[PDB]
Design a protein around this ligand. Sequence first.
Ligand code: CLA
Ligand code: CLA
Ligand code: CLA
Ligand code: CLA
Ligand code: LHG
Ligand code: A86
Ligand code: A86
Ligand code: BCR
Ligand code: SF4
Ligand code: SF4
Lengths: 73, 80, 63, 41, 162, 89, 180
Amino acid sequence: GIGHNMKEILDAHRPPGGRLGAGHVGLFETITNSLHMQLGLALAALGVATSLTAQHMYALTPYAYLSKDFTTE
Amino acid sequence: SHSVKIYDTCIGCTQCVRACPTDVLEMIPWGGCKAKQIASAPRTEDCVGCKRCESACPTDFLSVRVYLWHETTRSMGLAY
Amino acid sequence: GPKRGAKVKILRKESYWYKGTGSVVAVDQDPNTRYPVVVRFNKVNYANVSTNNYALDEIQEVE
Amino acid sequence: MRDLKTYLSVAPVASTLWFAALAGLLIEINRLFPDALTFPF
Amino acid sequence: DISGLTPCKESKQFAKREKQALKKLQASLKLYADDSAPALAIKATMEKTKKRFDNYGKYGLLCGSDGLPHLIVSGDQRHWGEFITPGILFLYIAGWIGWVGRSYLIAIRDEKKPTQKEIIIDVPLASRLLFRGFSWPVAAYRELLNGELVDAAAAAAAAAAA
Amino acid sequence: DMTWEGEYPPSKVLGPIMSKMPSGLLGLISIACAAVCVYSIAQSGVLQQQPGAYENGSWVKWYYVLGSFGGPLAWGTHVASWIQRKNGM
Amino acid sequence: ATGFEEVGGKPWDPLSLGKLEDANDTFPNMFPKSQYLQESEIKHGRMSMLAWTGVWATHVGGMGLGMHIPGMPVESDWTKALGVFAAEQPALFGAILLFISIAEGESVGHSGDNWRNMSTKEPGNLGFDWMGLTRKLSEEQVARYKIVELKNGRAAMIAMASLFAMEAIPGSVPIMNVFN
Ligand code: CLA
Ligand code: CLA
Ligand code: CLA
Ligand code: CLA
Ligand SMILES: CCCCCCCCCCCCCCCC(=O)OC[C@H](COP(=O)(O)OC[C@@H](O)CO)OC(=O)CCCCCCCCCCCCCCC
Ligand SMILES: CC(=O)O[C@H]1CC(C)(C)C(=C=C/C(C)=C/C=C/C(C)=C/C=C/C=C(C)/C=C/C=C(\C)C(=O)C[C@@]23O[C@]2(C)C[C@@H](O)CC3(C)C)[C@](C)(O)C1
Ligand SMILES: CC(=O)O[C@H]1CC(C)(C)C(=C=C/C(C)=C/C=C/C(C)=C/C=C/C=C(C)/C=C/C=C(\C)C(=O)C[C@@]23O[C@]2(C)C[C@@H](O)CC3(C)C)[C@](C)(O)C1
Ligand SMILES: CC1=C(/C=C/C(C)=C/C=C/C(C)=C/C=C/C=C(C)/C=C/C=C(C)/C=C/C2=C(C)CCCC2(C)C)C(C)(C)CCC1
Ligand code: SF4
Ligand code: SF4
């Protein structure tokens, strides 16, 4: 009973200024009925994430004695 | 074999048929344009896919259209 | 519709000259022709072709 | 000589004259006011 | 100062660069006789070099630990001569060309052969147009709030998609 | 059903509890929430500053954290009040 | 009587800033509508009439006013007088800021979009006609005092621009080097 419906969220987000057109109506159907859009959203977040792990690991070394073995870094 | 389709914007000026190097297209009677003739693709299995027919079609966009299809020995263009 | 010499706008989407203007040359009076209207243009397409046939619902008149 | 004038008005001839005048513009200014990293002069 | 930089007139490493650049040209000067053309050329080069260091010292530029001048583009008005003032200058000349060139295309468009006048310039007409771009910020502004700068959406051809 | 047209959205978007409620009550609640969030934050800051109250994270208190969480609640309530007012409620 | 007596009886829009948003189709609703520009001008004018009189009444010596509420902080210049008052009187400063925040939010909460001509209110019409004025006056006077409020708003906006320029550019307005 309690909780959100994703389709009801997306259909309600159309700014009344009209700048975004019809807003997000129809996006719920297009994401569920297509694996290439899901795959493309998943690959984009992992590519940002593994890039973020490359910057944070060299700056804030988390493992004991890291940044000593120069080659591994 | 390849697929060759012919749309209704065909004005029947026979230029695709004269350009085909493997005798795939021909002109047939038709009552929808000034020349009363439309192109037809009765032998698409000899079609090699070189698209010379589309380089010859004057309409915009093209009236004749070639779509890639499963390849046999004939459309691969082999002499062995 | 247009007459001979009228300036029209192409409404065909897959045409090279969509949203573009040009001049009617000949209108076939025989209605068996599906695209009766020869429209000429001063700019060429990618195949260096200067003209095309259209229907009456695919052209708009400018003034 | 109205045909030599149309020859001198063709795009590659006008481009080389315009560039010659403009390269030499920059060379002359760099000959009198050299080494101007910035306005400091 | 900004970024821990020092001014170039007070940088110990900027002064060492000045000396070593002069020493290199003096040790090349000693192999020639005093009136000859190679000795007069290198003497003129050391004057040009010495004036290059003096110019920067009073310039008001910032040096680093490397001894080289640095440029500040935050928008500080104190370092305007570094980016702002030559920036406003370039914008005036670049927007002058684009405006004048566009006037030309629009002018020869209404014609039998517009393409003929792009390979073979109508010079009397072109010369006239080139110098009318001296007041382009006023001319580009009059056409924006007229309707003659940007065309309508039903005049541009668009790809089948949209 | 969720999609809407015009200047303002329908009452149903707020949810089952919110749609029933009047604009005035919502506005008052939003103001109260805002007051609670600011006061709690100020108190937490004072605790952080205070000597002997900030050691080993002693400054953090459960109630102040609740008020801090409540800031977002204050924003939502005010938006809901505006919608209710628009729907003549 | 018209509002245009000093510009020649004609609408002074050089640079055509009211015609923008309609000249082209290219930014869809990114420039303000006439109703939003009219409320901004009234509001900038009303804040400038209060702020000029504020810096004029608290200036001590010179021409000056030196009037001062007892119990408040003595501060010479207006440039730092806010931050002194904000630190020393939190309860009074917080109650003024809340009053300004609600009244300014209520201005737009009951009416429609202003940025687009969809407001259904006259610009400048805050529900502050408590004196019952314009219900007793006739239509010639009511239309007149609107123009009086406008030009006095306009004289104070230029004043506040002078008051800003004299402290950022020390020789900017020369009539105040002398006036102090
Ligand atoms: C921010 C204040 C402000 C605003 C919103 C308006 C708005 C308006 N004025 Mg108005 N006006 C103002 C200040 C303002 N005015 C001042 C100070 C004066 C006295 C000179 C006037 C005198 C005046 C007249 C005589 C007329 C208008 C008119 C108009 C209307 C159409 C013009 C327009 O759209 O421009 C608004 C658009 C803007 C972008 C406003 C911003 C201005 C830019 C940013 C320049 C500011 C530079 C500034 C001086 C630099 C500061 C100095 C220093 C600190 C460096 C519109 C309702 C016309 C009207 O009513 O027609 C029916 C009309 O004829 N105004
Ligand atoms: C490589 C870099 C480069 C640079 C630095 C320039 C620079 C210039 N180009 Mg060029 N150009 C370039 C590359 C470049 N170009 C390239 C790659 C192309 C493509 C082929 C062009 C195409 C091109 C065209 C077609 C034109 C230019 C023009 C110009 C000039 C515009 C500004 C001007 O005329 O003077 C600045 C002039 C002023 C500031 C005068 C101010 C206005 C007057 C009325 C004020 C009077 C003040 C008074 C005289 C002062 C005396 C007072 C006294 C008391 C002291 C400028 C010199 C234009 C030109 O040559 O002008 C005719 C022009 O038409 N360019
Ligand atoms: C506009 C409303 C408003 C705001 C913004 C504030 C803000 C503040 N008051 Mg204040 N106050 C108000 C109304 C307000 N008060 C009223 C009506 C009264 C009663 C008359 C008081 C009585 C009062 C006293 C007696 C004291 C303060 C103090 C403070 C400060 C808190 C301590 C600190 O460092 O901040 C902490 C940081 C923050 C508050 C920022 C958090 C902001 C987050 C992002 C949430 C946003 C707030 C909220 C949800 C939105 C409010 C909506 C509103 C417009 C309706 C802070 C600057 C105390 C102080 O230190 O004095 C300087 C103090 O002693 N105030
Ligand atoms: C983005 C946040 C947001 C949104 C969507 C709203 C929405 C609304 N507010 Mg509200 N408000 C906000 C923030 C916000 N507020 C903040 C920060 C404060 C100060 C504490 C207030 C204080 C406030 C009051 C006092 C009142 C409203 C009212 C209203 C309602 C209509 C009138 C109006 O908008 O005028 C208010 C206009 C503003 C507050 C303008 C400021 C908007 C913010 C600060 C700009 C930031 C947006 C930015 C582009 C987001 C970028 C995205 C990302 C990068 C973060 C409407 C539901 C009124 C109401 O209840 O309806 C009757 C009312 O009286 N608001
Ligand atoms: C920037 C690129 C970031 C990556 C792209 C991600 C998308 C981000 C874009 C979304 C936001 C778009 C906002 C613009 C488009 C836009 O906002 O229009 C629409 C927006 C709100 O309009 P609505 O459509 O919600 O209509 C509501 C009204 O009808 C009231 O009912 O207008 C706003 O006021 C936004 C909030 C404040 C907007 C202005 C205040 C912010 C001040 C910023 C300072 C300006 C610089 C001044 C220099 C002097
Ligand atoms: C009876 C009647 O009619 O009443 C009238 C009264 C009155 C006044 C006239 C009316 C009005 C107008 C009203 C009520 C206006 C209200 C406006 C209001 C209340 C606007 C809040 C915004 C809140 C925000 C933006 C919250 C941000 C919160 C943010 C950005 C946070 O991230 C919070 C948080 O980050 C902290 C700080 C840190 C963490 O610890 C917790 C987290 C991370 C979550 C009405 C409507 O007419 C009704
Ligand atoms: C220089 C100096 O020292 O002076 C002092 C004193 C001075 C000037 C006083 C100062 C101040 C404080 C100020 C300015 C405070 C402002 C407060 C403000 C502005 C408060 C608005 C409330 C609006 C309401 C309640 C609206 C209700 C609206 C209502 C009830 C309606 O229904 C309107 C209705 O319209 C319709 C829709 C249609 C009509 O057919 C019918 C009616 C009319 C009924 C200063 C700044 O301290 C300076
Ligand atoms: C084509 C396509 C696609 C794709 C897309 C993509 C691939 C994208 C990407 C995108 C991206 C890749 C994005 C990114 C973004 C990011 C961001 C947006 C960020 C953010 C940030 C922020 C906002 C902030 C931050 C911060 C904080 C938090 C605090 C501290 C500081 C700072 C400020 C920095 C899809 C699938 C949809 C489908 C359709 C088509
Ligand atoms: S694709 Fe080549 S072989 Fe086939 S019909 Fe066209 S021109 Fe002839
Ligand atoms: S398809 Fe092209 S080449 Fe063939 S008859 Fe039609 S117009 Fe002529």
